[PDB]
RNA sequence: CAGUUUGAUAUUGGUGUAUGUCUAACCUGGGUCCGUGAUCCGGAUCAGGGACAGUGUCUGAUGGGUAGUU
RNA sequence: GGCGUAGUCGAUGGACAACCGGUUGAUAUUCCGGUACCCG
RNA sequence: GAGGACCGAACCCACCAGGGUUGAAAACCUGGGGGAUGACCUGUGGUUAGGGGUGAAAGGCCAAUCAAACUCCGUGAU
RNA sequence: AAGACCCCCGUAGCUGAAACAUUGACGGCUCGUUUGAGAGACACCCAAGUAGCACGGGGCCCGAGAAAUCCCGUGUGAAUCU
RNA sequence: AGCUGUCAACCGAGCUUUGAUCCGGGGGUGUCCGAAUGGGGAAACCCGGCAGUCGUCAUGGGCUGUCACCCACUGCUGAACACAUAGGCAGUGUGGAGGGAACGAGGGGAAGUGAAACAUCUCAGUACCCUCAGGAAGAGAAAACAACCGUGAUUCCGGGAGUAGUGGCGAGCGAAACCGGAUGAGGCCAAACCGCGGGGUUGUGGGAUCUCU
């Protein structure tokens, strides 16, 4: 391993998504994370199976632009996101909070 | 252009001889074939 | 343009009984010849001064 | 002025009586083969044309096709 | 600078495997239920 | 059961009239009107560029502009 | 906090660089030379399709004119110190 | 001895005399596009080869390097065809590609305008375009001037002079000799002759080659 040639799947999930929808997602065992927009269907499967050591059953990819905000001097634009929806398997469960 | 004959040419003379032709007749034919040589001081001690 | 020489083209003005000057052109004699550089058989644009001169 | 066109001259040579003939410059949008999987291109090689044509410089003719103006 | 060979792009065409029903305030041939299909 | 065939909606067009004319519209509305299986209409993708393109030919069209587009430059033209 | 040489920042005047840049000097280093001069011979060499010349042009005060020098294209085309 | 850029206040939470913030020099990182250069493309998007490597029963998937064209050179092979070349293969190169406000050298080259019309002419070798640069460029060491006296590479500035001249002798255009200044610098090859190297570098002509002192 170097400095260059070292990669950690903490870099793909850059976060939870905290939401009525994520609520309501959780009890079908969904859980939804922002993920690097870079990555694919497979990196996250990857990530996910790594970083919480689980059975990953699908993925499920919702790319969202970002939305246009008006300002004291004009419009600026939010960032685009990437959110993957992870179907875990049967009795498999992540902590978020 | 005048030249040295390397071969006898008809009309022309035997081998050897120093002749001014015309620059076609040497350039394109006589030149190509080995008939024929440009003259140079060089060429004159050769035949000698 | 001859490629052994460089020699190009040159220009200049056409000019009639009246004098007006229009633009021309001089080209330069320039003949294409099948030639033999470096035992290589090749064709050339040569100009007849080089051709004249031996240069082919 | 472009264009079309005439002649001289260079590319352009041999040989015979302005005009024949020859092959070697030059031309083939002719055939076949190779680069090569290739209707371009080039190189071979056979088949022709041929010092003619094409092209450069010089030159006469024509030139509302175009251009500047009265 | 113009054209163009091998090539390489170029759908408005060709080839290629999923349907019905339910659900949220906002998505559904995409999620859910049942039964299918294709490539490795 | 053929047709540059007939009547007639969609679609394409614009012969007449009235309205509009600082308009609802920098060319339209209402009622009539022509073609409506063909030289037809239309979508998508290409392509032709200014003394030039294209033109079933009106100097027509070439981004509301055409007997020679538009923009910058010569330029503070005359 | 209203017109400041002495309130502050500064100015006059001095002073300063581990690091790297620019540029000097020196040493290493690198290179060049290591026979030369005179007299007599000889006519061997001294930049070629060039100079000149003919035609058609360009530029020079010079608008091609009796037009020199300079540059371009086409043909023709030398000599080497007499 | 404070600090967490600014519009730009505000909250919250922190760093800091174990020397922060700030300043200067060096170094590491530097996604994707762009000459863009693995292939493609509607720039910032899409799809790969080869080698290595992480992961899995394995495909799928990650990460690193590398792969355009042209040119220079070294080697292998050598077509139709026999030499042979063309071409093909291999190995390398801190070689090129594109950008840039003005200035420069060499080429191409308008018209409006003026001429109270207009074509020679002017505008003007201007605008613009093309190739190539450098910190400057270009020019530059006499086949030069001058006039029988003489100066001694080039460049730039002020004169000579709006003069000599040139011009539908119209509108216009326009030097040189020489003078005063800024700076000051000279080197090397080809040829002949000898085996890419030696040789030699000239205007009072010099060099070669041979003979003599």
Redesign the pocket.
């Known amino acids: 391993v170097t400095?260059?040639?070292?990669?950690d799947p903490r870099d793909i999930l850059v976060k939870p998504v905290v939401?009525?929808?994520s609520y309501?997602l959780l009890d079908?065992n969904?859980y939804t994370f922002v993920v690097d927009p870079?990555?694919?269907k497979?990196?996250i499967?990857?990530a996910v199976e790594?970083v919480f050591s689980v059975k990953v059953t699908?993925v499920?990819t919702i790319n969202r632009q970002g939305k246009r905000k008006r300002?004291?001097?004009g419009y600026g634009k939010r960032a685009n996101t990437k959110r993957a929806?992870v179907?875990l398997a049967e009795g498999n469960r992540i902590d978020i909070f | 252009?005048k030249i040295i004959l390397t071969h006898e040419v008809?009309?022309?003379g035997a081998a050897g001889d120093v002749v001014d032709?015309?620059?076609?007749?040497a350039?394109?034919?006589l030149v190509?074939?080995g008939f024929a040589i440009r003259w140079t001081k060089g060429g004159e001690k050769d035949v000698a | 343009n001859?490629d052994v020489?460089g020699?190009?083209?040159?220009?200049?003005?056409?000019?009639?009984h009246?004098?007006?000057?229009?633009?021309?052109?001089?080209?330069?004699?320039?003949?294409?010849?099948?030639?033999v550089v470096?035992?290589?058989?090749?064709?050339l644009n040569v100009?007849?001064?080089?051709?004249?001169?031996?240069?082919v």
């Open positions: 400095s260059k040639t070292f990669t939401s009525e929808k309501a079908e969904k870079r990555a694919n497979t990196q499967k990857q790594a699908g499920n300002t004291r001097t929806i179907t | 252009m008809s009309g022309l032709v015309k620059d076609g007749y350039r394109n034919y190509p074939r | 001859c020489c020699k190009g083209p040159g220009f200049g003005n056409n000019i009639s009246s004098h007006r000057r229009t633009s021309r052109r001089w080209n330069p004699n320039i003949q294409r010849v099948r030639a470096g035992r290589t058989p090749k064709r100009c007849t001064s080089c051709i004249k001169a031996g240069k």
